[PDB]
């Protein structure tokens, strides 16, 4: 199979502290290379590469276009945030937290939650254990849930109480799930 | 804090163009070009919001006019194929005999064209499958998820088989109850 | 429910 040509348009609406500050970034990308962009913190198009210089020049003479792009911060960005807010920005799905061995390796499995941002901490007898915390990372599933697995390196002994704590916007207080040796 | 992208492309010879909204990297919805309908990523989204798709349909037609013109301005420079990283994960910690989902993460690739088949012990398994459209990346490459619900069992080998113009050959990515 | 909006694609100049 034979040569490909690709054009990409993207309108990015970036939100700071809610809708308080807002910045629109319109981008054109030819064959993976961005070539021109309107940045709303700039107020006009700029060529990102030379390919796009004719386009930056041209669009900057179209008044209706500049003015629309300049107001989009309110007419579009702030608008769409308002429509989707309840079920995007406010979307809460509480993590499911199981803890199981792997001797010498302990697993805090944290799955199905949403928004991404999270903390998992490890506790040995309710005293925090910070050494030998390994983290596979945070996985976006594509379906509006994330998942995490945070490890801890310890060789367990009889008695010892282990505990995983998970802070999350979906719960006012953090989940502690324990595991016993 | 939050980013919302209206993400669009047209692909010159394939004559595919897609349109979709992205919130922090999750599809809110895309427009199906063939049926000219809005297709909500989670069914509930359609109850709390609507999309009238005409504007979207007309952008794709501009995107194509633009491609037509950019193709030429570049003296017909083709795109440099970039092969995807593929990763096979479950939805949750694999529990013997309790329903789970397999996720095929296809990542960091350009031309947004891939052929993806789930294989079970060897045979392609078409039942219960689903997929996402081509989602945006900051680097301008794409992501894309394939799913397969299954009964975790001791017997089964599962491959995610991925085809692309950047790979010398189809990539099989392995999975079996740990 | 409420309409999500769009911003229209800009035409690159005719060659």
């Amino acid at each position: 199979t034979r040569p490909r040509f690709l054009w990409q348009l993207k309108f990015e609406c970036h939100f700071f502290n809610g809708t308080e500050r807002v910045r629109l970034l319109e981008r054109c990308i030819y064959n993976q290379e961005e070539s021109v962009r309107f940045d709303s913190d700039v107020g006009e198009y700029r060529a990102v590469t030379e390919l796009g210089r004719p386009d930056a020049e041209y669009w900057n003479s179209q008044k209706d276009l500049l003015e629309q792009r300049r107001a989009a911060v309110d007419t579009y960005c702030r608008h769409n945030y308002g429509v989707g807010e309840s079920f995007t920005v406010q979307r809460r799905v509480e993590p499911k937290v199981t803890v199981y061995p792997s001797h010498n390796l302990l697993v805090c499995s944290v799955s199905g939650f949403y928004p991404g941002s999270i903390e998992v901490r490890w506790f040995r007898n309710g005293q925090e254990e910070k050494a030998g915390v390994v983290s596979t990372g945070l996985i976006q599933n594509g379906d509006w849930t994330f998942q995490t697995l945070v490890m801890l390196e310890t060789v367990p002994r009889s008695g010892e109480v282990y505990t995983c704590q998970v802070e999350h916007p979906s719960v006012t207080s953090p989940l502690t799930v324990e595991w016993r040796a | 804090e939050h980013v919302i992208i209206q993400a669009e492309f047209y692909l010159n010879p394939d004559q595919s163009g897609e349109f979709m909204f992205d919130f922090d990297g999750d599809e809110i919805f895309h427009v199906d070009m063939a049926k000219k309908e809005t297709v909500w990523r989670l069914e509930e989204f359609g109850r709390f919001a609507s999309f009238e798709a005409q504007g979207a349909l007309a952008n794709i037609a501009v995107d194509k006019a633009n491609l037509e013109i950019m193709t030429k301005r570049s003296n017909y420079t083709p795109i440099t194929n970039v092969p995807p990283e593929v990763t096979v994960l479950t939805n949750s910690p694999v529990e013997l005999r309790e329903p789970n989902v397999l996720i095929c993460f296809i990542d960091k690739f350009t031309p947004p064209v891939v052929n993806v088949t789930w294989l079970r012990n060897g045979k392609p398994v078409t039942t219960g499958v689903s997929e996402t459209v081509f989602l945006p990346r900051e680097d301008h490459l794409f992501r894309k998820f394939h799913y397969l619900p299954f009964l975790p069992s001791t017997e089964d080998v599962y491959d995610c088989r991925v085809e692309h113009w950047g790979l010398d050959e189809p990539l099989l990515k392995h999975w079996e109850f740990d | 429910g409420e309409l999500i909006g769009t911003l229209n694609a800009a035409k690159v100049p005719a060659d």
Partner: T-cell receptor
Amino acid sequence: GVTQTPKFRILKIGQSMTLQCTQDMNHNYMYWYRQDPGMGLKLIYYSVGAGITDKGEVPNGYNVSRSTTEDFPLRLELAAPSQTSVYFCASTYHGTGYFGEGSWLTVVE
Amino acid sequence: IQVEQSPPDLILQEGANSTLRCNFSDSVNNLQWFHQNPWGQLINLFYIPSGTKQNGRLSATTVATERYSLLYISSSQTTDSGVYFCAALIQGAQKLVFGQGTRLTINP
């Protein structure tokens, strides 16, 4: 700007007719409106680009096609008195809307 | 969806200042002002999706946040008579869409 023809036309009942509408501005979006004496502009039909047409509030009795960006012909299949109106065509894309000079049409018994 | 225009009717003496109100629902934006004249002719006065814009004796403000636009006419002239239409663009469908308008009459 936008230019539209018949500025004026007298049509008999049952006759057909075409109102042309053209625009050299490259606007992708075009609309036909109607207006009844001292009333509001109601929408007959509209188009956001070549090969895309969509009904308005009052589309019944009119057809429309848009094979090019430039032209947006309105076509009255069969004249009924109810179609005595002033018709208006428009174009925008990114901002300012632009109107044709008007079509005054009376359908007669 | 829609576009609510306030005073349907206004009669004022020349040289007076007149304020026109157009309230728009969430379903539309990217506001505009038109003047028909008593012979059916229509011109744009402003494309004014947000902020203040001014052209001679005319000025317009739109607060996109708060869903209203306002056409101001200082020192009204008899010639400004006619109908003032406000119009917006439905989000998504780019259906341009017109309110009932304000018959303005400026007496000598």
